[PDB]
Scaffold this active site. Structure first.
Site, short mmCIF file in Angstrom:
data_model
loop_
_atom_site.label_atom_id
_atom_site.label_comp_id
_atom_site.label_asym_id
_atom_site.label_seq_id
_atom_site.Cartn_x
_atom_site.Cartn_y
_atom_site.Cartn_z
N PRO A 79 41.14 44.51 36.59
CG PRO A 79 41.49 46.78 36.82
CD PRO A 79 42.22 45.50 36.64
CB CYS A 80 37.54 42.86 33.06
SG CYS A 80 36.91 42.17 31.54
CD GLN A 81 34.78 47.37 27.06
OE1 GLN A 81 35.84 47.09 26.48
NE2 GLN A 81 33.67 47.71 26.41
N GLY A 82 34.24 44.31 30.96
CA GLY A 82 33.11 43.51 31.42
C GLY A 82 31.82 43.81 30.68
#
Ligand code: CL
Length: 348
Positions: A79-82
């Site tokens: 996952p990534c904040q993105g």
């Protein structure tokens, strides 16, 4: 037997890609109960660990297996904040910590756009550092799904590393699409029922008879190419009788229905923001698309087809959950192509 573990597996889009490419998906790790239950339905012989990856390390993982399992590949979606917050950036780093601790022959991470932002260059560099000592890290692969014969134009980044000790040469030839016939909306939706049960959120499966009298690469993937030990037994049995799940509609008011009937191909409804599919186009990045011919949003099974899932893949019963499971997945068709490149490399 080349063995993989799938971290942040969701329902198993990337897992199905791995399995079709020849890998044995030995373990899936996924925090969401619905996603991991669905993964277990479709991959009943994989181990399922419903866990926060932050609570894992190499020794704990070897402990789960108990059998000194060689982990040849670690694949997943860190996952990534993105474009959105903080815990996803921690989870990103844990993916790469696990790769570093476990030392697989290769890793493959998939990410959506958002990952390449300047504000994440610190954590991406920190993650590159954990692995660059032991891995040949390939430059980012940015792919459009439709180039691999999936009916959707969604883009995805793949980040691949291979153990330096293997001394492999990697040309892009292996990952590039070759001999691929494009699959438009009209082709992907062929033979599904024109009349469906339109309800609100019903609790029962919508098993329906389809026409399966078509030929070609997409249809072989749609109705077959079931990897060894993969697949829900009832779904497979029903498919033999031309019956598949997920053909459940949504009840719309007549005013909504008339508004959707009036949409031209590609047109976005000014009010709901749903866009009518173009039958000779592809599904945009998966609000619900409107069917090209019928005045309604698409069904979960239609969305599954457009994302590149086979008809025998079984999703959660509710529309709400199945659409999320589908939207959150890597296309199995794209996943298979990329992972087969890696499998072939490791068999030389
Ligand atoms: Cl994809």
């Amino acid at each position: 037997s080349l063995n993989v573990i799938d971290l942040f597996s969701g329902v198993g889009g990337l897992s199905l890609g791995a399995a079709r490419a020849g890998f044995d998906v030995k373990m899936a790790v996924e925090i969401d109960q619905h996603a991991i239950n669905t993964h277990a339905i479709n991959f009943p012989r994989s181990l399922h660990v419903q866990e926060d990856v932050s609570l894992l390390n190499a020794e704990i993982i070897k402990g789960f297996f108990k059998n000194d399992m060689p982990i040849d590949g670690i694949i997943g979606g860190p996952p990534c904040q993105g474009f959105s917050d903080d815990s996803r950036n921690q989870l990103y780093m844990h993916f790469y910590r696990l790769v570093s601790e476990l030392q697989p022959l290769f890793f493959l991470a998939e990410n959506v756009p958002g990952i390449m932002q300047e504000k994440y260059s610190g954590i991406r560099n920190k993650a590159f550092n954990l692995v660059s000592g032991d891995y040949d890290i390939l430059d980012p692969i940015k792919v459009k799904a439709s180039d691999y014969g999936a009916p959707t134009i969604r883009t995805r980044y793949f980040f691949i590393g291979v153990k330096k000790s293997l001394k492999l040469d990697i040309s892009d030839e292996v990952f590039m699409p070759k001999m691929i016939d494009p699959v438009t909306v009209k082709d992907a939706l062929y033979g599904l029922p024109d009349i469906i049960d339109a309800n609100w959120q019903s609790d029962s499966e919508s098993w329906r008879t389809i026409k399966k009298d078509r030929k070609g690469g997409f249809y072989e993937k749609l109705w077959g190419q079931i990897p060894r030990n993969v697949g829900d037994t009832e779904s497979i049995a029903k498919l033999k009788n031309n019956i598949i799940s997920g053909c459940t509609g949504t009840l719309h008011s007549k005013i909504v229905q008339e508004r959707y009937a009036s949409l031209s191909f590609g047109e976005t409804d000014k009010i709901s923001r749903s866009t009518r599919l173009d039958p000779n186009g592809f599904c945009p990045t998966l609000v619900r698309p409107i069917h090209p011919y019928h005045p309604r949003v698409i069904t979960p099974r239609e969305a599954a087809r457009l994302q590149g899932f086979p008809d025998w893949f079984r999703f959660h019963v509710t529309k709400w959950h199945s659409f999320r499971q589908i939207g959150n997945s890597v296309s199995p068709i794209v996943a298979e192509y990329i992972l087969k490149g890696l499998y072939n490399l490791l068999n030389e």
